[PDB]
Design a protein around this ligand. Sequence first.
Ligand SMILES: CC(=O)N[C@@H]1[C@@H](O)[C@H](O[C@H]2O[C@H](CO)[C@H](O)[C@H](O[C@]3(C(=O)O)C[C@H](O)[C@@H](NC(C)=O)[C@H]([C@H](O)[C@H](O)CO)O3)[C@H]2O)[C@@H](CO)O[C@H]1O
Ligand SMILES: CC(=O)N[C@@H]1[C@@H](O)[C@H](O[C@H]2O[C@H](CO)[C@H](O)[C@H](O[C@]3(C(=O)O)C[C@H](O)[C@@H](NC(C)=O)[C@H]([C@H](O)[C@H](O)CO)O3)[C@H]2O)[C@@H](CO)O[C@H]1O
Ligand SMILES: CC(=O)N[C@@H]1[C@@H](O)[C@H](O[C@H]2O[C@H](CO)[C@H](O)[C@H](O[C@]3(C(=O)O)C[C@H](O)[C@@H](NC(C)=O)[C@H]([C@H](O)[C@H](O)CO)O3)[C@H]2O)[C@@H](CO)O[C@H]1O
Lengths: 50, 559, 51, 51, 51, 50, 559
Amino acid sequence: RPNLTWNPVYQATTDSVANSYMNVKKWLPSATGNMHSDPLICRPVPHMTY
Amino acid sequence: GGGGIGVSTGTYDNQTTYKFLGDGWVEITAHASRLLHLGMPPSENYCRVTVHNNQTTGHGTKVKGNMAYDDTHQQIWTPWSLVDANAWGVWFQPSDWQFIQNSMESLNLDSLSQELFNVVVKTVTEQQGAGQDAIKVYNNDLTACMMVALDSNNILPYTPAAQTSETLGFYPWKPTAPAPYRYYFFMPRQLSVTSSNSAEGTQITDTIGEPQALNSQFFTIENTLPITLLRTGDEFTTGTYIFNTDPLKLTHTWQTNRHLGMPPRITDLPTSDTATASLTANGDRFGSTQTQNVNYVTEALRTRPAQIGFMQPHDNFEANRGGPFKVPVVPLDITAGEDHDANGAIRFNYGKQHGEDWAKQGAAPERYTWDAIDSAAGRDTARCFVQSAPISIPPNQNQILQREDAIAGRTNMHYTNVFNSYGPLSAFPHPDPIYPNGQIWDKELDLEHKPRLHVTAPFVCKNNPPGQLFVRLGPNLTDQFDPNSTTVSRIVTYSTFYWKGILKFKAKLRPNLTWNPVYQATTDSVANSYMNVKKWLPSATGNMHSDPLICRPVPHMTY
Amino acid sequence: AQIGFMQPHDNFEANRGGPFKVPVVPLDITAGEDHDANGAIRFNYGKQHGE
Amino acid sequence: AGRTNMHYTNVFNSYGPLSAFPHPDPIYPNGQIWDKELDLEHKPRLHVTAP
Amino acid sequence: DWAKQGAAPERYTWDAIDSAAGRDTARCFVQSAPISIPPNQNQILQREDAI
Amino acid sequence: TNRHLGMPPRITDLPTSDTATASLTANGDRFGSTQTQNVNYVTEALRTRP
Amino acid sequence: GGGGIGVSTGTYDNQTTYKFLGDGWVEITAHASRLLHLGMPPSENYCRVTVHNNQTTGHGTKVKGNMAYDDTHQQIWTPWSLVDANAWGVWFQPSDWQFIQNSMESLNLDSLSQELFNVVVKTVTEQQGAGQDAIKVYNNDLTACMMVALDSNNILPYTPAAQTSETLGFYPWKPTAPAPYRYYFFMPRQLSVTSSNSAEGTQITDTIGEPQALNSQFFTIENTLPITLLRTGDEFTTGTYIFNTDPLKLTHTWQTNRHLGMPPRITDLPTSDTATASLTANGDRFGSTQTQNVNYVTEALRTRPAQIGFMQPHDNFEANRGGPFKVPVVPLDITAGEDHDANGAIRFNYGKQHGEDWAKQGAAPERYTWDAIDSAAGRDTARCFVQSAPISIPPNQNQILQREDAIAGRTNMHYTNVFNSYGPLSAFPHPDPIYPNGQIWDKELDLEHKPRLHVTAPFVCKNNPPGQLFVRLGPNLTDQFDPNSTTVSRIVTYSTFYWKGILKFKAKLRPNLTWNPVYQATTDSVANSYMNVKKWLPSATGNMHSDPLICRPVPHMTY
Ligand SMILES: CC(=O)N[C@@H]1[C@@H](O)[C@H](O[C@H]2O[C@H](CO)[C@H](O)[C@H](O[C@]3(C(=O)O)C[C@H](O)[C@@H](NC(C)=O)[C@H]([C@H](O)[C@H](O)CO)O3)[C@H]2O)[C@@H](CO)O[C@H]1O
Ligand SMILES: CC(=O)N[C@@H]1[C@@H](O)[C@H](O[C@H]2O[C@H](CO)[C@H](O)[C@H](O[C@]3(C(=O)O)C[C@H](O)[C@@H](NC(C)=O)[C@H]([C@H](O)[C@H](O)CO)O3)[C@H]2O)[C@@H](CO)O[C@H]1O
Ligand SMILES: CC(=O)N[C@@H]1[C@@H](O)[C@H](O[C@H]2O[C@H](CO)[C@H](O)[C@H](O[C@]3(C(=O)O)C[C@H](O)[C@@H](NC(C)=O)[C@H]([C@H](O)[C@H](O)CO)O3)[C@H]2O)[C@@H](CO)O[C@H]1O
């Protein structure tokens, strides 16, 4: 993608905030090995239409 | 050498040349030159300005039913200005338009080249005089520079000035000015839908939101475009853009679904010139219909190849995260019912530089409504009707949906307002060009899938539109400058520069194959006539006005 | 996607040339025998064409 | 609109970007074979009279 | 989630990331031409209007 | 959206304070194009969009 | 020919181009252009100025225990100014930084080129007006000249302005100014070490010394550098410097000594997701330790290959012939104890041109503390402890040196303050770059033996750094000039010139080999969030602020 905007752009990122849809814990294996893959965001960068 | 402060850096040329090539092909090269006045930007800072009309009185949005008066939005104000010349009037004398409309059958864009020359930057100083009437002295800042930028890759938001009537002037002998460049910035916007009859307690929700990262884009001319500094003896050239577009028909249609295919056979020829003719009994007549409950064929029930034109929802004020908006309507024939909104008539407001009578005093702008010249795809809402199948002719009050029929108990609401007949059989003409207050070319929308046509311009660049030309005056700093201070004392400075553009068109002479004489755009001397030549003649005081001219005067057979 | 589509019935639109039955894409009358809703084509012919 | 025999179906158009329909069937022997296209800058997807 | 016990399947609703082509039905409205601003209860088709 | 297409309306003057809004030219005196003729004013909502 | 007063002598270019070469290599060419305002030097004489704060009150050095407030020093003031652009913000939009941080894994300097163009020298004259409000008239001195010098051989003292926040502005649309060049001159300096609790009679020794030949060096730009006189139609070019430096990692580490090597084998897998696991009895566990008094192996006693990070003396105010100075500390992780000083956190104070909210009123500068993004080499002083050999676990109050233990009877003094664990096994990460208030490159110290790294910049030229650019306005003498007189009547004169620089970088795209999603630098719309996009968006009044952005967001395996 090209970068031509002064303002920083929104990017898909994980966090450590508790009960956060993006808590890395979700994409990490459990102690028993249980794994889950919740849907990830797409098209995070905006583009000018006109 | 070539560069010099005392030498001119360009040539004023404003003439439309016609080169007839052959087989009826015409190369129309339109030269346009204008003098531009640029001043210092009130601020040298990019600004995120918010406009919000929450007034609880007048045309505010806290007034029940003023939803349409919504002018709320956020925009990035830029110290840069824009030299936009995308309007038919900036490229052709009224006569040129007439010749093309009356003699040519097709017109397509070819190439565009633009040049900035003869830059003059001047400083204003005030000398003290008697009566305390300080005189203003204008001096030449030979070393001063004007910043010029061209966005060829079209990275910055496209802003056609024609819509705001902020394009260059339509009169080559009058000075002009560029338009301050500005672009919308996403801002959450929600406005409740109410009515003048809504309960007094009804609370209207007029709310604006804080910037959202997912949709926040801030661009600066400096961090995106290469900027050329222009001094008195400097010139700018934009090269030669090539237009890749679809040709525009200079002819109108007239054939409705009732004029498609072999007409019904008359029994016998009319007896007298004042006599009508008779067809075979509908029951005995041969033909094809799509209604089976009936055992007869009538011109109205006859199956036609397709649908010329289509019904369009009226005042469909849709609403997104950006507030309510009038859904655009394909410009078609208002018909004999003069149903402008039903057919998308375009009413535009303009100023003296764009054809308002210079004599006209008062701020009130000139307002003209453009009705499509087309006479084939229009819809007369008052005559349109829907019947119940199995078709029963004649029907009863409960077997037909006439327009007067109220919808949802709203007396003035009719199915026509919410009826969309667009389908795979809908066939309509393309928007007519509007000299001289009409945008010529337009940028396509970067959506994976796009609209069939744009209601604002007859031409849509099929790839990348001509680059926007940006101009600004640099801060003329004084002796006192604190880089850590917001305030920036600056020398009053203005600049004048000449702009020249060359727009080329590929047109083709129209064929003449009709016995009857054809309708042509002509002027007259009849008093109070929209075409009284006096209108396009200079006044005694020199006042000039250019009222819109007709287009597509010659009809062409549709089927 | 959508196989087929609903089509306005007896949309008699009107221009400068008078009223006209809007054509309907010929589709399946279905088990409801909805001919007009699906644009059934009824044609009238003479001896030279199969009468 | 209080019309007993009028139903939303009569004024309902579901044509959209997802609508997919077959093309008109030829009708031996009383059927037009070829047809002329309409000289409109933009044209219909198909003609109901000819395949 | 492998831990999630019970037959009940995992259910997720995907909302389009797009923020430009959506339609807020509650805010959408249709007015009568000739347009009269501000309109009266009989000059505007608000959503709450029953059909 | 359609409300973010084309050159925005010209603000009369820049906002005075960071907490201040801006004013446009009177809709009656404002220049522009609409598809509604029963009205003699141009409003961002009534503005003709491509 | 090419030279002319009316012709421009350069092009404004401020865009970051990204050229993807292959195998993931990226050529990042950063163009930066700024308008500079230069004024007449208050004096045209080089001056040996002495600063000495001997006040017996307030923040003076005759106050017991104000040793740290020492600002005493001698400097050679020069009529010359310096065009320094050694700061990350002067070369990249906030977005550019984010893209590089989130997508690239390495970054190295390549080449640097600088150009001075469009020189404009103007004179200020005052005309008498009513109300005795003399107006200031600004005229063009076409024949005036601006003196430019480049010290490529680096003979003059190196002065990175970034440290004084005196580099060029970080906003390309705002005018900027160079920084007055000045360099320290050796001056004997001795200050006694006292405490707020010292005896009232305690006499503090605050003494300064006379210049010492053994250490006296006076340099003048004129007698050391070739000077280029620049007139309105003149241009300066510094050529293309080539950077010979070591690449910078754009990734952080997380592995401490407790995360090095094969982990201990769990007896059995955890039973429930909420259950922990058990290892083999430390007595029966296999492994290697460096403590023999114990017959067991514990993760903490396990022998590790080396030492990730190291303890550093706190506030080691060492003292030479130049007075006391805070010994620098390798920037590391403040850890969960937030031990900033123990880990060398960098707190910097800057002004509007460098990211202070333009709205912020008051002289008070913006103050930000930079904590190293690293999470592996930090030291939590509160948790650190030293035990006595033969190791006795658990130890007694006399067998362990906990932090709270006072040293030399000073209650708040702890061994940690005087403990240095740097050794042959110490392994630490290199200083993180700090957009946008961070020095990029730095000069190496001409000592026969040099430091492993510099705490001020991520890049150290391994040979000779880019030459410093010096600019000054020549004395505009009047009619009255006495060469034998010290006083020099001069015409008020100021100059404005455009600076353009091209900095090129060799970067490499990061690899993705982890199942879990990776942490990326992102903005949000959450209210009062350090990353609320509103911060990097222009205000309604145009106020702009650039708060520091995170770096090295992606982690990399250390061992
Ligand atoms: C006569 C009738 O049955 N109804 C008219 C109706 O036509 C009229 O609408 C327009 O026509 C009048 C005719 O005088 C007038 O033109 C109106 O307003 C102006 C305008 O918008 O300012 C007057 C301007 O002078 C004119 N422009 C020029 C330079 O001639 C424009 C322009 O011609 C018009 O916008 C084209 O559509 O029209 C028109 O709105 C309305 C007026 O309320 O009602 C009856 O008078
Ligand atoms: C809070 C409010 O105003 N209204 C909520 C409404 O949002 C909620 O709908 C969803 O949100 C809740 C929030 O806890 C919950 O997520 C609901 O149901 C589940 C589901 O469908 O099973 C729970 C799942 O755990 C979740 N998936 C995972 C793995 O996290 C899914 C999924 O997030 C969701 O389908 C995405 O749309 O949601 C959601 O339906 C409804 C619930 O009745 O009403 C209020 O609680
Ligand atoms: C909350 C707690 O346990 N202790 C806080 C402690 O964090 C705080 O130190 C800093 O954090 C506060 C939080 O509001 C504030 O940021 C302090 O001072 C400022 C400053 O130095 O001027 C305020 C500025 O607005 C800010 N910069 C900007 C533009 O946001 C800077 C900057 O964020 C900071 O220097 C980064 O380290 O901080 C901080 O010093 C102290 C304050 O005494 O004690 C508790 O409040």
